Amino acid sequence: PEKFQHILRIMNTNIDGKRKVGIAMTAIKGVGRRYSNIVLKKADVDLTKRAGECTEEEVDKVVTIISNPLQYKVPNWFLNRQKDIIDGKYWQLTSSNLDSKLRDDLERLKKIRSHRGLRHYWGLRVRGQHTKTTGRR
Amino acid sequence: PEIKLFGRWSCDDVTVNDISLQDYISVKEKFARYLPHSAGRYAAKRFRKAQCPIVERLTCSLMMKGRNNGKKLMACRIVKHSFEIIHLLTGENPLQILVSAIINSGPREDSTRIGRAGTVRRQAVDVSPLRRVNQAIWLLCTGAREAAFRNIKTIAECLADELINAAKGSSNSYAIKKKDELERVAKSNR
Amino acid sequence: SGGGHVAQIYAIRQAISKALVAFYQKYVDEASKKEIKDILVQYDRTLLVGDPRRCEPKKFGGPGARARYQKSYR
Amino acid sequence: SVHRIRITLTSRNVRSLENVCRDLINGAKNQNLRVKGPVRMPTKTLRITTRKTPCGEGSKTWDRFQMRIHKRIIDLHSPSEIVKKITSINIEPGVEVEVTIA
Amino acid sequence: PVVWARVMKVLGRTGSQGQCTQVKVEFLGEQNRQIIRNVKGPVREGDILTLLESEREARRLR
Amino acid sequence: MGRVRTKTVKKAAKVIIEKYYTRLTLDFHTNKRICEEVAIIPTKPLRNKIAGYVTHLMGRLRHSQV
Amino acid sequence: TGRIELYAEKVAARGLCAIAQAESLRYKLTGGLAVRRACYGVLRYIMESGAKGCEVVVSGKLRGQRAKSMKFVDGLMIHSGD
Amino acid sequence: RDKLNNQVLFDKATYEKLYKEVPAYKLITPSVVSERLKIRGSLAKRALIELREKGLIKQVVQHHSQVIYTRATK
Amino acid sequence: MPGVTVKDIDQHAVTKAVAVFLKKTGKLKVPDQMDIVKTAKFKELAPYDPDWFYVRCASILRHLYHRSPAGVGSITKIYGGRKRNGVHPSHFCRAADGAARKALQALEHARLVEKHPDGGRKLSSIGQRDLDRIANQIVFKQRDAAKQTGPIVI
RNA sequence: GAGACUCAAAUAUAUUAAAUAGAUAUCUUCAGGAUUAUGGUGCUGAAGCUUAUGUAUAUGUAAGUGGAGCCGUACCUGUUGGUUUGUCCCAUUAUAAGGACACUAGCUUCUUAAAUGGACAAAUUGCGUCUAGCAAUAAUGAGAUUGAGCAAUAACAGGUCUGUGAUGCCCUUAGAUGUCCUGGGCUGCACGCGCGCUACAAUGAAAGUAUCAACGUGUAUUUCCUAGACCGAGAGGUCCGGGUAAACCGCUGAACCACUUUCAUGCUUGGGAUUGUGAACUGAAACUGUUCACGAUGAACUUGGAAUUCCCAGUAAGUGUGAGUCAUUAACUCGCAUUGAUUACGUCCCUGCCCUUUGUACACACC
């Protein structure tokens, strides 16, 4: 029943509310498709529904499971980062923090003059996948 | 005790309302199958496709474009549902309406690219009737494709829209437009 | 036992239709046989006929039995 | 003493196998051991697939290799002499003979 | 006014691509006259052919 | 569909007809059984073919001298 | 020891073998060996042994740089079929 | 690029509108109900289940991928 | 006619109805995550129709008895086709081993199955008893709907 | 040479057997249902449910709750064991066996392979020199039956010295170009190509659920296929059992597919690139990467120009599987089943090639 909310903002990302909840969340860096099976269902959201539907209350509940997943029965193995290295906390990285730590992990290896490092630096592919035919555009 | 019905549909009183198209539109003049599914060895002889019910032809022909290929079990339910929609839009027997839909679309002439020594002019050639029924069935299926593809609209709905649009020839239909162009080229060439 | 969803189930239709005719050989009559045979052969769907059409052997230079790969150019 | 004995025979060539089995069954049946005779087992088609080319380079012709091994079982119920005679003759061309106590 | 015509004889194949079949039709409405039109695909004896244009007869370029 | 039967089939068929004509009928099944008895044809598909080409030759012989 | 024993046996009517005749050609050849004596000679010998056909192929450069082939056939030789 | 990303949620003004609109739509089906803007594929399927409650819809067809009903006939 | 559901094995009316009866008696023990569980390496996403555990445990129940012992390695092969191995290839890859399996453990605690010699599971004490009992009641339910249909005509 | 031939794919168990696969009938066993019929307890209180306790969640007992069914059998449907001349009384540890009975209380329609018979374009009729043949029809499992294998004379400076310890000559050979040990390349990317794989959707994807296989293959001086039990989302970890295999994994009950939902054409829930991450596995050792899941990041692609490959029936196309290579490594390759077309049943037009006809001063032959 009813209308509204279309274009809802969760941590520093614009979310098109016109897409069914899980699928909408893919505009959030960190919150693609497959955790809406974790997050919404354990947050007790009615799952046949829109992201443009459902109370701010449910939005807050969803945010807490995302950032604190271990405490809601979410296995360690279902978290983006097991065993970080640094602080070695089981963490699901959200939003812009994903981007920042992505840079930080490149930078660890760039400093040292690592293989991984230097293939980030010049770019190309740090997973050594064949650029004989492909890597281009 | 013998005889009777397609899916629940009366085979009897289904008139092919066009001589020449009688018998190459092989409805079920004795052939009361029940299902549009058949083991269907129609390919060995040239004239053995003349035998196979037009409903069965429609099922065979729906499932082309490679992902979709050879799912005859997909095909038969869609033609059965297209029947049922056809019965609701115009009212009567949906077998009669399929037969009428194939009739309207059937192409008068055509052109072949005879080599003519620098500037290749075409020579115009009349159509054989063992291509009229098949090409009708095929372009009703292409019209059903095109409308249903990016549309919300179900294949069964777009088949039934295409078929009824053909049956009382509102023209409109993709089938008629493409064919009429081939005929116009045939009218010129001579 | 065997083959597939349509293949098996198609084969049951043959099995029953053929079977009934046999009962009439030994016990009832050809009267019952012939009337049945006429009905079966006429509308057909190979009900009395053991289908020969079986999987042609796949051919060297093809993943498919006549269907070759490649691009010889010309 | 009756000892129940099962002889298994494995070997390749069609016609030779038939004649070895035939003699053993007939001699057994003649001297009424009453047998339960020739268990004709499915022939195992052993398939190797290779390119006709040593050194790959010509328009992909494949030569593939098949071998058929034919297995056949005969059951005898007898002791001392009859067991050892009937096993040791029919022997000579390409037959592997296995005798099992039961 | 479409007049229908019945395949009397299948005469031959004409074409550089050999698609076309030549066919004699004696017309169903008033028999006694026989016209050759060339038919596109495959024809067999007493197939029926729809004459859009009752007469005008093509023939053959070898 | 295609084909006329090769020289080994046809030659065999001409030679048997000359000698055996009396005892060769328009009927195939008897022509099959005469051929194995009178002639050592090693294999059954070849025997049937020879005997069968005799059946064909006999059919035309009846329809005014061949 | 004594779990395997080898026994010598004659090859049936010697001349037919092809392998016996092939060995004969190598010993003749290394002794030297004129050709029409040899090729037609082996061909003649096995045909004499009542063999239906025979083909001897020499593919080889005899004294002149380039490899030459000749097939010497007297026979009904199938080559083909089962 | 013809956008058209319509409206999820019953929107009770449209739900009333839907009821009145449905006859002469003799093709009346979750896609036609969509076509007349306020596209729901599958909550229009529930809108049909709601019509099936008695009044309007003559269900000849109940099918996955083709869900065909009717106006309440002449 | 008397009875006839099938006897061991699914089919379509039976599986949904047996599943529903399992929902009613609620003692199944749904391994905490299963909202999250793709069921699969082969299947992109987790149950859009969230209630898959109940229908799965019904599916395996009826499956098991006909085979005699149909445990864990077997159940992955039948159930759950067809894997998008990312960019390459389109394939058949075995289902999530534990996802099907834990429902078998669930049914053992639900006591709808007894331990077999030479078998993990032969249901022929109480597992079969409940299954074919609800199965016959399901045909009677279909019959009851037909008995109701009789008067209407519409 | 082609062919004929042989093999495989099609038909009779009529003929030979059978640890499989099975008609189905008997005996035996377990389960449910009342549709129908009958008997047994029951408003004098039945089934069911709950709690406590004792004993090993189950059972018994006590109490409460409950309010008309509950149980057995014939019958029907399903399960299990023996039942391919069986069973019993006797033998043997268990068959045959001996005597009795069913005197057939399981045969082979169906697997597999031994052997036969089955197609000859048979019958007829159009067509044709009324020839060889062709076309059509009916009968048939198949209408010259469908597909391979096999292959000549003669030709090529085709490819291969990196299969070969077959091989000429030369080189190399105490500083190896042999070989081994350690480490790296083959796996590097402005860029041209070729095979593919995967897509662009909605005849669909997402998600439940219906569920049907085959060809091959598997541990002997070994560490293979692994059923079944537990933990794990998954990879895997962990203990047992079967199988050197008509026996067991395995009817490889595989995928596409069936059915019902969710979604609505929006680079979208299509698509799955890249990415930092990420638990193990194989190995002595895993960094332009050995491989792999989950968790994540979430690209082009919105049907591809000139060109060009392949294809006429279980063929095409979709779709999976098994085998090989192999410690690890499949988008490969070879077979196999499955779902199963649209369309020619024409012709030499394009292309390629042979054959006649011609010219030739060519003949180590138009490189």
UniProtKB/Swiss-Prot annotation, chain D:
Modified residues (Phosphoserine): S1
SMART domains reported in the protein's UniProt record: Ribosomal_S10 (SM01403)
Protein origin, superkingdom: Eukaryota
One term of GO molecular function: RNA binding
GO biological process, one term: translation
A single Gene Ontology CC term: cytosolic small ribosomal subunit
Keyword Ribonucleoprotein belongs to the record: yes
Annotated keywords: Phosphoprotein, Ribonucleoprotein, Ribosomal protein
Xref: SUPFAM superfamilies: Ribosomal protein S10
InterPro entries: Ribosomal_uS10 (IPR001848), Ribosomal_uS10_CS (IPR018268), Ribosomal_uS10_dom (IPR027486), Ribosomal_uS10_dom_sf (IPR036838), Ribosomal_uS10_euk/arc (IPR005729)
Tissues showing expression: Expressed ubiquitously in embryos, highest expression is in the midgut.
Family matches, as Pfam families: Ribosomal_S10 (PF00338)
PROSITE patterns: RIBOSOMAL_S10
Stated family: Belongs to the universal ribosomal protein uS10 family.
HAMAP family for this protein: Ribosomal_uS10 (MF_00508)
Name of protein: Small ribosomal subunit protein uS10
Organism listed in the record: Drosophila melanogaster (Fruit fly)
UniProtKB/Swiss-Prot annotation, chain E:
Transmembrane stretches, start-end: none
Keyword Ribonucleoprotein attached: yes
PROSITE patterns for the chain: RIBOSOMAL_S28E
Keywords assigned: Ribonucleoprotein, Ribosomal protein
GO cellular component, one term: cytosolic small ribosomal subunit
InterPro entries listed in its UniProt record: NA-bd_OB-fold, Ribosomal_eS28, Ribosomal_eS28_CS
Example GO biological process: ribosomal small subunit assembly
GO molecular function: structural constituent of ribosome
Annotated Pfam families: Ribosomal_S28e
CDD domains with a match to the protein in the record: S1_S28E (cd04457)
Protein family: Belongs to the eukaryotic ribosomal protein eS28 family.
Identification of the protein by name: Small ribosomal subunit protein eS28
Organism encoding this protein: Drosophila melanogaster
GN (gene name): RpS28b
UniProtKB/Swiss-Prot annotation, chain H:
Ribosomal protein keyword on record: yes
Keyword Nucleotidyltransferase among record annotations: no
GO molecular function, one term: structural constituent of ribosome
Domain of life of the source: Eukaryota
Any one cellular-component term (Gene Ontology): cytosolic small ribosomal subunit
Keywords: Ribonucleoprotein, Ribosomal protein
Example GO BP: cytoplasmic translation
Family: Belongs to the eukaryotic ribosomal protein eS25 family.
Protein name: Small ribosomal subunit protein eS25
Organism: Drosophila melanogaster
Full protein stretch here: 40 to 113 of 117
Swiss-Prot record, chain I:
Pfam families: Ribosomal_S19e
Annotated Gene Ontology cellular component terms: cytosolic ribosome; cytosolic small ribosomal subunit
Keyword Ribonucleoprotein: yes
Cross-referenced SUPFAM superfamilies: Winged helix' DNA-binding domain
Molecular function per GO: RNA binding; structural constituent of ribosome
Protein keywords: Ribonucleoprotein, Ribosomal protein
Gene3D superfamilies for this protein: Winged helix-like DNA-binding domain superfamily/Winged helix DNA-binding domain
Source organism, top-level taxon: Eukaryota
Similarity section: Belongs to the eukaryotic ribosomal protein eS19 family.
Name the record gives this protein: Small ribosomal subunit protein eS19A
UniProt source species: Drosophila melanogaster (Fruit fly)
Lineage: Eukaryota, Metazoa, Ecdysozoa, Arthropoda, Hexapoda
Gene name linked to the record: RpS19a
